Amino acid sequence: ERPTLPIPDLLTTDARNRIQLTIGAGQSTFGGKTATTWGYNGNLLGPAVKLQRGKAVTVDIYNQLTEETTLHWHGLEVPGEVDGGPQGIIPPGGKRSVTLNVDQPAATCWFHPHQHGKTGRQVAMGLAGLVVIEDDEILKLMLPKQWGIDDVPVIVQDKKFSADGQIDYQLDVMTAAVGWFGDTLLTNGAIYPQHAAPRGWLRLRLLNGCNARSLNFATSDNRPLYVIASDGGLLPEPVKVSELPVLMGERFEVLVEVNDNKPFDLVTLPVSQMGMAIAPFDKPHPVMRIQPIAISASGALPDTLSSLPALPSLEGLTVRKLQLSMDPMLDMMGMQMLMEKYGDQAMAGFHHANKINGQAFDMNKPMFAAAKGQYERWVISGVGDMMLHPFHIHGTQFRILSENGKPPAAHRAGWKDTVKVEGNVSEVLVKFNHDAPKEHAYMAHCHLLEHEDTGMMLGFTV
Ligand SMILES: [Ag+]
Ligand SMILES: [Ag+]
Ligand SMILES: [Ag+]
Ligand SMILES: [Cu+2]
Ligand SMILES: [Cu+2]
Ligand SMILES: [Cu+2]
Ligand SMILES: [Cu+2]
Ligand SMILES: [O]
Numbered sequence: 001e002r003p004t005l006p007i008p009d010l011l012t013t014d015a016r017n018r019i020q021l022t023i024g025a026g027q028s029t030f031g032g033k034t035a036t037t038w039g040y041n042g043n044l045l046g047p048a049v050k051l052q053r054g055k056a057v058t059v060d061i062y063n064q065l066t067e068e069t070t071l072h073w074h075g076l077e078v079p080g081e082v083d084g085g086p087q088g089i090i091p092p093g094g095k096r097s098v099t100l101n102v103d104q105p106a107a108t109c110w111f112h113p114h115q116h117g118k119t120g121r122q123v124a125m126g127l128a129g130l131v132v133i134e135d136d137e138i139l140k141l142m143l144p145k146q147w148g149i150d151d152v153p154v155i156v157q158d159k160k161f162s163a164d165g166q167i168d169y170q171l172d173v174m175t176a177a178v179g180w181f182g183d184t185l186l187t188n189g190a191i192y193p194q195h196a197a198p199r200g201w202l203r204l205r206l207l208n209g210c211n212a213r214s215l216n217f218a219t220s221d222n223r224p225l226y227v228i229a230s231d232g233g234l235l236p237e238p239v240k241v242s243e244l245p246v247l248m249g250e251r252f253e254v255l256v257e258v259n260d261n262k263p264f265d266l267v268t269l270p271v272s273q274m275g276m277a278i279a280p281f282d283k284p285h286p287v288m289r290i291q292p293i294a295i296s297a298s299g300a301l302p303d304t305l306s307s308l309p310a311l312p313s314l315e316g317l318t319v320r321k322l323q324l325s326m327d328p329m330l331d332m333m334g335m336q337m338l339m340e341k342y343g344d345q346a347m348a349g350f351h352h353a354n355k356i357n358g359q360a361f362d363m364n365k366p367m368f369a370a371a372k373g374q375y376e377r378w379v380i381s382g383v384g385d386m387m388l389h390p391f392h393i394h395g396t397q398f399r400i401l402s403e404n405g406k407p408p409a410a411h412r413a414g415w416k417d418t419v420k421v422e423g424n425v426s427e428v429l430v431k432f433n434h435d436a437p438k439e440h441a442y443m444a445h446c447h448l449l450e451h452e453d454t455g456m457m458l459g460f461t462v
Contacts, residue, residue, distance in 0.1 A: 002289055005195040006188040007148035008130055008155075009047040013057050019049055021071070023090070023127065024064040030184065030191065033165035037126035038065065044189045046111070046129025048153055053135035056101045063090040068115060069122055073100070073131060074249060075109030075231055075397070075417050080436020080462070083394055085443045086116035086363055103433065104397065105306070106138035107131075107233040107415070108153070108205040108251045116363060117351070120180055120211050120449035124169040126189075128155060128209045137306060138234065144203040144255070144299030151299075152195060152202070156268070156287055157209040158182045174341075176350045176454045177326065177334020178275045178387070179212020185268070187288045194289040197258050200297030202290065203228075204266070205253045208246040211449040214273050214388060217244040217287070219256065220265035226301055229253040232397030232415025234305040239411040243269060247390035249447040250418050252411070255301050258292045265289055272349030273388050274335070278342050308414055311399055311429060318376045320368065322444065324389050324421060324456060327353040331385075352455045354446070360455025366441045367458040375431050377401070378444075382421040389421045389451065394442040395462065398430040418447060432462045 011019055026043030027034050040046030051057060061071050068091060072084035082088075082098040090096045109131035113122035130153050144150035160182025162168040169180060187193050208215050217225065226238040231251050238255065246252055256266075266287040270277045330353035338346045352360035357367065370376060380391045382404075397415040400408040405424035407413075419426045436442040441459035445452045 002192055002194040003190050005152065005193040005288055006190055008045060008153055008188065010050050010132065010147045011047040012050045017056070018058050018060055020060045020062070022062045022064055023069060028189065030161060033161070035161060035166050037167070038122070039126050040129050044126040045155060046127070048130035048132050049111070051100065051102045051131060051133045053102050053104065053106070053133065056099055058097055058099045060095060060097050061090055062095045063092055066092050068092060070114040071111060072114040073109060073111045075107060075251070076100070076131065077104045077396060077433060079434040080395070080440035080442055083436065083440060083442060085114050085394065085441065087440050088114065102133060104133065105233040106135045107133050107229065107231070108253055109133060110207055110251065117453050120171060120453050121169050123449060124159065124167060124180060124211055130155070130207070141302050141305065142300045143228070144201050144297060150198055150202055150297045153188065153205045153207065154266070154288065155188050155207045155209045156215060157186050158213050159184050159186060171450055171453060173330065173333045173350050174337040175450045176353060177330050178338050179448045179450050181211065181213045181275050183280070185285055185287065192286055192288065194291050196291045196293050198293050198295045198297035199258055199260055201255045201299040201301055202258050202297070203253060203255055203299065205251065206246060207251050208248055210248055212248060213276050214248060214271050215246050216269040216271050217246060218242065218267050218269050218284070220267050223257060223264060225254040225256050227252055227254050227411040228305055230411065230414050231417040235411060235414045236308050237303065237305055238301055241411060247418055247420060247447070249390060249392055258290060258297070260292055260294050263289060263291050270349060275338055275346055277348035278345050282345065282348060311401070312375045314377065318371060320376060320378045322378060322380045323357050324380065324382045324385060324446065325355050326385055326387065330354070350454055354451045354454045354456035356456060356458045359458070361457035363459065366438055366461050369461045370432055372432055372435065372462050375429055377427060378430055379425060379427045380419065380421050381425040382423055383425060386423055387448070389446040389448060389456070390418045391421045391426065392418045392447045393430060393444045395432050395434060395436060396430050398428045401427040401429055434462065436462045
């Protein structure tokens with residue numbers, strides 16, 4: 001009765017070493033009602049671009065929208081010139097080609113628009129894809145590896161729709177303060193899908209592709225999840241968890257056991273984030289149904305996944321302070337609107353009003369030049385402010401030293417491109433191995449997209 005989990009195509013290069021991505025407007029059905037949606041190579045979401053470490057690929061990006069957009073590869077360590085930040089304009093009806101020389105370990109990354117001031121909308125409308133980066137190392141592990149059967153991407157996103165069927169997106173005082181969130185949960189575009197998985201291990205590549213909703217993954221019968229990777233690749237070993245908090249733009253890959261005749265749900269648990277526990281999200285919410293199939297999966301859960309370097313010495317490293325803030329007026333007005341619409345349940349558990357170091361994002365004025373090839377220490381503070389800011393830095397995979405006032409949890413102590421900042425201070429160890437000049441600067445920003453779109457971003461050069 002549930003629709004099957006849609007599986008994004010795993011797209012590799014053709015004879016010319018090219019991948020074609022068409023950005024376009026189509027239609028989808030939600031709850032039997034049609035909406036205009038945008039997608040990459042289809043109506044909605046996108047394919048998974050498969051990359052190999054050490055190899056180049058050229059991506060041809062045809063923008064068939066009637067408005068401008070950009071194409072960013074979130075999690076990829078590439079020069080600014082192909083980063084697809086807001087300076088990477090692709091005119092409506094035009095084409096832009098980018099050559100990606102992949103130089104990082106195996107990981108599940110993703111891609112989405114980075115259009116100046118409109119990224120929340122373009123994502124809400126449907127635009128997101130995946131990136132599966134492979135290397136020599138990972139294939140030796142014998143992980144579940146059959147794409148769409150025992151190795152599946154799970155892109156989880158919320159939307160809200162108006163009475164006429166259409167996606168109801170707005171960037172206004174309330175959303176700019178608390179984020180765009182909705183009442184309907186999608187999994188690879190589908191409402192409460194089911195996925196048929198063989199007996200043994202199921203690998204789920206989880207992406208929180210929500211604009212502003214943080215999620216927290218668990219199983220309906222509390223079977224454990226074994227985390228094997230974070231934003232930037234494998235952990236040294238599996239880390240067993242009963243629940244998995246995932247911030248906006250974060251990825252984790254987990255293994256979960258599948259047994260004959262015992263279906264279970266992947267669920268998300270209520271989070272203590274402003275706006276995000278309004279019913280049906282005040283209770284555990286299903287994400288998808290796992291249907292065991294009485295066929296043996298070949299995949300293993302290895303004792304040992306890979307190696308993390310020790311953290312580099314802290315003495316002598318440059319420190320950059322990035323103070324996050326939101327105009328007090330934006331905050332009071334936004335939270336009032338939140339409380340007035342939804343009341344107390346909204347606490348269960350403006351275009352340049354959001355800033356970093358007192359400055360709302362200035363596309364023409366990068367805030368600093370970072371060293372190339374040198375570890376730096378970036379200290380990101382949300383002190384003075386009560387909103388959730390998952391802070392993301394372009395052009396790198398860093399190590400978390402402190403996450404919002406604490407040492408990182410085990411499954412969060414490996415390769416990360418996002419870090420939690422919420423009323424406290426975070427510190428990360430970051431290195432950039434590629435150039436980004438002022439014309440194609442790197443972004444560092446909050447990934448609660450409505451904050452980003454209203455100033456909580458800076459450009460930096462390498
Ligand atoms: Ag006011
Ligand atoms: Ag409140
Ligand atoms: Ag705030
Ligand atoms: Cu992103
Ligand atoms: Cu990014
Ligand atoms: Cu934020
Ligand atoms: Cu970004
Ligand atoms: O991003």
